Amino acid sequence: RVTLQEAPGTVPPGRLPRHREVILLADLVDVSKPGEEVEVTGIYKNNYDGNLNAKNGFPVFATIIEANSIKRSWTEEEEREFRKISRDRGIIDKIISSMAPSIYGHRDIKTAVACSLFGGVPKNVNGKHSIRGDINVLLLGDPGTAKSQILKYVEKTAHRAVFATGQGASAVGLTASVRKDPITKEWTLEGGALVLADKGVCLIDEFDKMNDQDRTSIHEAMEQQSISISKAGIVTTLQARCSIIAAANPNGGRYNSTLPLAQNVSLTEPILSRFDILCVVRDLVDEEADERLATFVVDSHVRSHPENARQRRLQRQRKKEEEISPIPQELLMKYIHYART
Amino acid sequence: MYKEKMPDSQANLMDRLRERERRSAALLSQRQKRYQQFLAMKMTQVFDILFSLTRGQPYTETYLSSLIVDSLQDSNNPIGTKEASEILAGLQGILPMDISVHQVDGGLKVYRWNSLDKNRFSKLL
Amino acid sequence: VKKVDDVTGEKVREAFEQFLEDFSKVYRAQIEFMKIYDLNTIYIDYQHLSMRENGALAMAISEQYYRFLPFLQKGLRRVVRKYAPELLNTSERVFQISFFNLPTVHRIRDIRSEKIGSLLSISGTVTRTSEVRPELYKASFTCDMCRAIVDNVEQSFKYTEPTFCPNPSCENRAFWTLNVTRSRFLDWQKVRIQENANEIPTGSMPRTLDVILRGDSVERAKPGDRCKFTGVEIVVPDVTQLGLPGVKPSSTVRDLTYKISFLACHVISIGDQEVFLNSLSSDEINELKEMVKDEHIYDKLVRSIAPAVFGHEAVKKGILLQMLGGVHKSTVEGIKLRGDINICVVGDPSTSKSQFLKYVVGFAPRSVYTSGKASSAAGLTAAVVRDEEGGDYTIEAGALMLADNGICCIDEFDKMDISDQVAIHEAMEQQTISIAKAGIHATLNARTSILAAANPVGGRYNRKLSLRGNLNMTAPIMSRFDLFFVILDDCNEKIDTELASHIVDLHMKPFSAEQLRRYIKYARTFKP
Amino acid sequence: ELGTSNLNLDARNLLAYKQTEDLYHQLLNYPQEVISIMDQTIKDCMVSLIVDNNLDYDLDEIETKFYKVRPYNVGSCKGMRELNPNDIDKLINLKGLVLRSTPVIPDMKVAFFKCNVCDHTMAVEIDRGVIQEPARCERIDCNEPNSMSLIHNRCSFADKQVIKLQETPDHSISLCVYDELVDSCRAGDRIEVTGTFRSIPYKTYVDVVHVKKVITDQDLAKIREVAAREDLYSLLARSIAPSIYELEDVKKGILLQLFGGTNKTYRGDINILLCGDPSTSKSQILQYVHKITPRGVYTSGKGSSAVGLTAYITRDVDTKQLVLESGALVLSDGGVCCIDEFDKMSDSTRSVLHEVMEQQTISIAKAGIITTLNARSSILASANPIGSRYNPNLPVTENIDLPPPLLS
Ligand SMILES: Nc1ncnc2c1ncn2[C@@H]1O[C@H](COP(=O)(O)OP(=O)(O)O)[C@@H](O)[C@H]1O
Ligand SMILES: Nc1ncnc2c1ncn2[C@@H]1O[C@H](COP(=O)(O)OP(=O)(O)O)[C@@H](O)[C@H]1O
Ligand SMILES: Nc1ncnc2c1ncn2[C@@H]1O[C@H](COP(=O)(O)OP(=O)(O)O)[C@@H](O)[C@H]1O
Ligand SMILES: [Zn+2]
Ligand SMILES: [Zn+2]
């Protein structure tokens, strides 16, 4: 018996994730493990008969799916357009400019975001040695620098993204939680946010203000891309192959330009060593830069305001996308998926 | 903006203020009449509450007035508690034949309305 | 052998069929719409039901609804066979009726045993919900001795086996085989709601109740929503009555305990110029229009917030603007722009800063009042608590999730511990609450406007120093308040004389407070 | 004239008249019989005064309905703990304060049985808590035995509620109420009880028959005489506390605090702080006030906490709503509380005093609980000065260890 949960990027706004019980029979066992994404074909049947008719009010049952076949992929029409795009000279600059178009400036951050989205090669050299393939990014700066809304673009762009807040997270919740099976009464383990974000990206906002233990829980995940646990006799390690994007504020809430980085933050050199790219932001004042930023922001707020009709509205939306980005965003998402694949 | 650039009126500005003054009371009276009509029209959408699910007689006016508010009226057009009390008091005057509530010692106790009909008596407005 | 007939029920069914045939035939158009779109449930406006026979039909149906429902169901299915027999086809006559638009709405406070078996409407804030399940509406059984079949075995609130084998040539009883293919099922859901804040007087605790939903109406209830239900009250067996004092009746031995639950058929959540305007009458439109089409309305509304507090006009403007928060925007990139406005006020221990909070919580359609030291991190955002009916966790609404799309008031803000001030930040800027604790990984709506009150670091305003040294709040939290006021006290005689006069008149005793809610309900929809 | 379904009989008239006192002494063991007789007596009296006297004509609903009578001022008994096993089922009178209420619980009155083979329906009612299932269908044709079945939601029930009351005999007792008596008593109600003391095969509980939600002219003459004499203030100060010499201003202030201001809807809860030297008689005054004033609670700031003052609040599985374990500060509702060692109160506890003194309320928002509680009370407090003695070489504000927001 295996539980299938809604994909992290597919949860509807403001609702808890839905899930169903899936029954694997006839040698269809061990086809999947926690963290894997699968598609299954089966029969929608009811089998929860018993005391439920009297324990809860009125006679009711519960539904399960008995699995028949399961599977853990691109047409030529998509690859042709991808290869058409790939031959453009200087494609890197278009891709970098494509990240979060409504955010003005911060190109040195946008490049890091794009690089983390594409990622590298997890070179398992000779098997006996391994290297993490994903880039870790820390966004440190003063308030009013969009260190948070960038994560609200990675969450909407990457194939599988998980977002968490520093004080709204727990060490058990992020890594893994222990459960007792309702049928076999045995100790069982359920993956946390890092296990869910496997082969994806994990987002942690306000990374500085979380308690020290929840911050410590991220140590193994940032380099081993795995979760090691020993609770209630359960000893196992899960895959947590995800990149981490963290946003934080400096000590006192404003960056002291006259002091080093190793003094402006409550973090420590170990934690900083697990990152690759550190983006330091100053909210310094200047008439020209401020005028540029304000005239960009006011037009962004003009655009985002409301105002075969489906086709016409899609055309108008893509027109607005062209007004601000060189690449259509659906094509960018597909391109990122294809490149990672 | 600066639209009032050259309204070069004569001493008739005093007569303009007379126009402002001497008819303001008429507008206030019209606003009061409009509130009266507001109540006299909302009572048409209230008596269904009384008709539907109240046949006993333990209901004091304090209960029914608090039941007109925090009710179907809690909607695109909310209503106030004192407005609900005014509605419930005006129902007796507008329908003498079915409501004869009397002061007990403090406040009013409302009994089971006879309810000959529902809305045909609104013609008196 | 002829069974006993309900002649009143037959008359009711005939009247209901005549109502269906004569009402104008919009409901027959609804039936055709259901046939076109493959719909299971028909919906009936109660005020349409109450406009035939002076509404006596509706009264009779409502006051004994649990009895008369089968007759109306029979009438409707006869009508559908008369006009749309294809809806009886499967791949077998499942059909539901849902009434809405009740005139009266009843509180959890006013639940009585007299209301049992009658149609009524209630409203309450949802706190916990269970997952949807299938319910055995009508079952069928096959005999065990012989192989006869028994259809249409309605399972009234309990698992019910057939009492006899229909063929007299068989003596089967107390043993049956349940069919799971010819039998038909329906959706099931339970909603656990709470009494609203404006119902309970101060010093009184809110009541809780469990509400039952079935059919397609399920999943339309979300936590934190001021939902509204329509249906009938039904009692269900209870096991917690044991140990109570007083004589308990017995059946002969068997137990006969009960507890009260509400079954609702229609679900709606309370909440674009023309849509709103078409729901108001001419006089209502005129009354709302006077408050909009006048030259000085802005100053008039400024001079109307909290009329008991003298002076302090800046905060009166601020609260008025906060109550009409900005339009929320979503970028073509999908990034969302926050629209709600936060306000912080700091004053000396003498200036009336708490009365603004009390006026807001007493006036706002949705509002929650709390104290800085009394509040905690879990009590503001959301609480991770073990759920009933299972071993998994489930959220509970904190101070921020409650009064969503409303104003949240916090007093003694500077007294709050920083570790539980931090959690308010995400709601203050992202309008969301993110949870990654104990099997919950969802992100919740936190569209709330934060209103706070605080005191300087030394209680008194140390007027020797500047604004920088008199506040313990750091830059990150100060940056998130769209408006920020520091009000002071001075020994000016002309001010203190009037202040004394009015604060003494208080102890001696343009637009009314009721009108402001009506105005805001119209104003809030605009998108400049 | 009244459309009411019951009459509150002025049971103090039973003691004001001789034969009714004898009736009380006879009735002490049999209230139910007299109440049942009085129901029919009321119906007959109504019928007579309406039609026999030809004064009214509205009779039908009164004729058909059932009435009750509730005596509300019966003479009190010897006290709850003094009641004997043979005092059970006797009419009793008690007093106290209500704390908690259970939700509305329906109690069976009518049973609706339907025959499951011919749909015939029988009306069955409960007599003395007994359900009698019909053995066979009553129809001449349908004689199938045991075919009668009960439809749960076509039955009729009545409201039953359990209310918790802290009783003070002339300990807590959980009362029982039925019919319109439910939800008439709520948390915090000041209650006098007239009903039946019960213990049945054995928990002690009261079947309430009525509930009350609440001197000589020579005393008036004495009050007027004391008020008229010119030394009224001097005499009052002199007689309040003999062990404390002089201190006219302190006497006047504390007596004024006992008098209290006017309450309008703006309370009059006067609060006084003693900042004298740490050897002046101040504990002797507060300890005496705790005994002379109408009863309150005596507390100390050092020996108190935030939970100790306000309350402990938690949900309940049985009640399905929040319940409170009242603290001293809320227990003093409407009375007077004394707080020694006010300078030693913890900061978290001191934060509670703010909203208490500013709005007479306490708002709490924690995990699963969001509610406000009323704590309207007057606070008399004593606080030693900073150091071993009051030092006039320092400012008066600096001699007190209370922050400006609390001190001002
Ligand atoms: N460089 C920028 N260009 C355009 N808009 C910006 C920029 N920086 C910040 N903003 C605006 O300011 C807000 C910053 O939100 P947030 O990400 O919470 O700030 P931070 O995380 O830096 O404290 C965003 O809503 C965004 O619209
Ligand atoms: N402008 C005003 N009008 C009326 N009353 C006022 C005004 N300013 C102050 N007050 C009175 O002073 C008191 C101030 O209390 P407040 O400063 O709100 O306490 P806290 O600082 O604990 O919130 C209020 O009870 C109020 O009655
Ligand atoms: N004016 C006075 N009248 C009666 N007793 C007094 C007076 N002044 C001091 N005392 C006595 O001095 C002792 C000290 O009491 P008090 O000063 O009230 O508290 P503390 O011992 O905490 O300072 C008490 O036993 C009291 O009887
Ligand atoms: Zn058979
Ligand atoms: Zn029969």
Side-chain angles (χ1 to χ4, degrees), chain A residues 102-106 141-150 205 247 249 293 296-297 300-301, chain C residues 335-338 429-430 480:
Chain A
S102 290
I103 302 183
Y104 178 91
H106 295 258
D142 301 327
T145 56
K147 306 170 298 302
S148 316
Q149 292 219 333
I150 286 170
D205 190 21
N249 291 277
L293 190 143
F296 199 90
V297 163
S300 178
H301 285 68
Chain C
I335 315 173
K336 296 183 293 185
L337 299 165
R338 168 177 64 103
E429 81 186 356
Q430 257 67 278
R480 306 186 195 217

Side-chain angles (χ1 to χ4, degrees), chain B residues 34-35 63 66 70 74 77, chain C residues 110 198 226 284 290 515:
Chain B
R34 280 172 179 162
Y35 277 110
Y63 181 80
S66 193
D70 201 344
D74 197 42
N77 194 20
Chain C
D110 304 338
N198 74 282
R226 273 197 66 203
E284 292 174 295
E290 288 182 16
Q515 311 174 235

